[PDB]
Ligand binder design. Sequence first.
Ligand code: 0DV
Ligand code: 0DV
Ligand code: CL
Ligand code: CL
Ligand code: MG
Ligand code: MG
Ligand code: MG
Ligand code: MG
Ligand code: MG
Ligand code: MG
Ligand code: MG
Ligand code: MG
Lengths: 228, 228, 6, 6
Amino acid sequence: AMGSMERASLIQKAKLAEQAERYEDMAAFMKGAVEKGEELSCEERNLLSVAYKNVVGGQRAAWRVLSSIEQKSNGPEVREYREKVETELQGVCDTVLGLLDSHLIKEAGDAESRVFYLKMKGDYYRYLAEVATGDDKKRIIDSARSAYQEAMDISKKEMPPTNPIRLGLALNFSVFHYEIANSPEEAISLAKTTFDEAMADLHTLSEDSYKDSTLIMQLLRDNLTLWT
Amino acid sequence: AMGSMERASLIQKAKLAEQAERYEDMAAFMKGAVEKGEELSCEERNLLSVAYKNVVGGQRAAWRVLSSIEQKSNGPEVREYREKVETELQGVCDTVLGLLDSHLIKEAGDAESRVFYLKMKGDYYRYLAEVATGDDKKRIIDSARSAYQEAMDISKKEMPPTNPIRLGLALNFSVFHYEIANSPEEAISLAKTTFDEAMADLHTLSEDSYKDSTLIMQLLRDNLTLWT
Amino acid sequence: KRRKSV
Amino acid sequence: KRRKSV
Ligand SMILES: CC(C)C1=C2[C@@H](O[C@H]3O[C@H](CO)[C@H](O)[C@@H](O)[C@H]3O)[C@H](O)[C@H](C)[C@@H]3CC[C@H](CO)/C3=C/[C@@]2(C)CC1
Ligand SMILES: CC(C)C1=C2[C@@H](O[C@H]3O[C@H](CO)[C@H](O)[C@@H](O)[C@H]3O)[C@H](O)[C@H](C)[C@@H]3CC[C@H](CO)/C3=C/[C@@]2(C)CC1
Ligand SMILES: [Cl-]
Ligand SMILES: [Cl-]
Ligand SMILES: [Mg+2]
Ligand SMILES: [Mg+2]
Ligand SMILES: [Mg+2]
Ligand SMILES: [Mg+2]
Ligand SMILES: [Mg+2]
Ligand SMILES: [Mg+2]
Ligand SMILES: [Mg+2]
Ligand SMILES: [Mg+2]
C-alpha cells in the first residue's frame, strides 16, 4: 500500500510516526521503505527495528495477559480472544521474517548490517516460539537458534566486544536460552562472558560510545541479577 | 463485523481487551454490542466510553504532536501525515456519533443513561472541533455546545450535584468553554459552581460514593488551579 | 500540566 | 522484574 510514496518520504513519515508514538504507522512506513528494494542505512535499520519491536511488544504483552487468564480458567471466549491476538502476533512476525528473507539478509554484506538482520530473524522466530506448541515448535525454536548462532559467529569475527548490536544480540540470545531453550546455565554463561569481554574493551571507546555500550551492559547485569 | 458474535461474548471480550490494554479491540467489541440493538447497562456504557476515549485519546495526542511540528515548519510530508491522522480521528468520532444517533440516545429514557450519552455526544463533537477550521467549524462547535447543554439541563433536574456523570459532564463542558469556545470566564464559573455544589452534598454520601465524587472534584480543582 | 477532562 | 531484551 506504500508503493506510490517516495522512499525518502516514507523514511521521513516513519520518524514523524515515532515522535507521535504511532508505531503501527511507523512499521507500515518502514515496510514500504524496505519494499523499495534498496539496502537500508544504519539509521533506517534502527527505525525498522524500533517500529516492529513496539508493535509486536504490545501484542506480546496482551497475549501474556490473556494466556494468564486462560490458564487460571483451566466458555470459549478467553481462548478465542487469546487465539485472535496470537494470530495477529504471528502475522506481524511473518511479515518481518518475510522482509528479512525478501531480500534484506541476502543483500547484507557488511558485518553491521548482516548481524543486525540475523539478530532480528532470531528475535521474531523467538516471538513465534513464545506462542508455539509441540514439535512444529521444535523447528521454530531451532530457526531462532540458527539465526542467532550465525549472527554470533559473524559478530565475534567482525565486531568489537563493545559493539551495541553485538551486545544486544548476546543479551537476546541469552534470553532465548533461558526461557525458550530451557538452558538457564547457557543463558547465564553467555551473559557473563559477554559482560566481561565488553568491560575489558571499554577503554578503547569515546565518551559517546562508552555511554552506548554500558547501557546494554547494564541490561546484561540486570538479567544476571535476576537469574542468580 | 461483530454481527455473528453473541452480545454477552462481545461484552466479555471487551472486558478481556481492557485488561490487555487492547483498546481498539475493546472499542470494536463494544460497537458490536451496541449494534445488537438493546439498551446498554451502566457497566456496559462505561466499557463503551473507556474504549473509545482511549482510542481517540491516542489519535489526539498524536495529532497534537504532528500539528506542533507542522506549525514550526510553517515538503508536504508533515502536513500529509497530520491529515492522515486527522482523517482517522474524524472517522472514529463519526463512528461514535453514529452509535449515539442510531439509536442509543433516542432509546435512553433514564436520566443516568441520557446524560451519559449526551455528554459523549458533546465530547466527540468537541474532538471534531479541536481539528476543524473556519465556519464548517462553527456548526461543529455549536453541536458540542447543544449536546452538553441538554445534558446539563437534565443532570441539574434529575441528579444530585455529586453524581460522577454530572461532575464529569461539567468538567468537560468547562474545558469546552476554555479551549474551544474562547470563554475562559465561563469555564472558570462553571468549574467553581460545580465544585461548590458538590462539596455541599458530600455529607449525604457513603464512603464509596464519597471516593467516586471527590476523585472528579479534584480534576475540577486541578483545572481551576491551572486557569487562575 | 495539561487541563483535565474525563 | 521482567528479564531485559533489546
Ligand atoms: C537505546 C538503544 C539501546 C537501542 C538501539 C540502538 O541505539 C540507537 O537508536 C536509538 C534512537 O532510535 C538510540 O536512542 C540512539 O542513541 C542510537 O545510538 C543501538 O545502537 C542498537 C542498534 C541496539 C542494540 C540491539 C538493538 C537492535 O536490534 C538495538 C536497537 C536500538 C535501535 C533500540 C534500542
Ligand atoms: C475513574 C472514573 C473517574 C471514571 C469512570 C467512571 O467510574 C467507573 O468505571 C471505572 C471502571 O471502568 C472506575 O475505575 C470504577 O471505579 C467505576 O466507579 C465514573 O463513574 C463516571 C461514569 C466518569 C465521569 C464521567 C465519565 C463518563 O463519560 C466517567 C467515566 C469512567 C467510566 C472513566 C473514568
Ligand atoms: Cl475473538
Ligand atoms: Cl501520510
Ligand atoms: Mg523514487
Ligand atoms: Mg494458535
Ligand atoms: Mg550489499
Ligand atoms: Mg569490524
Ligand atoms: Mg443472541
Ligand atoms: Mg482535514
Ligand atoms: Mg429506554
Ligand atoms: Mg435522580
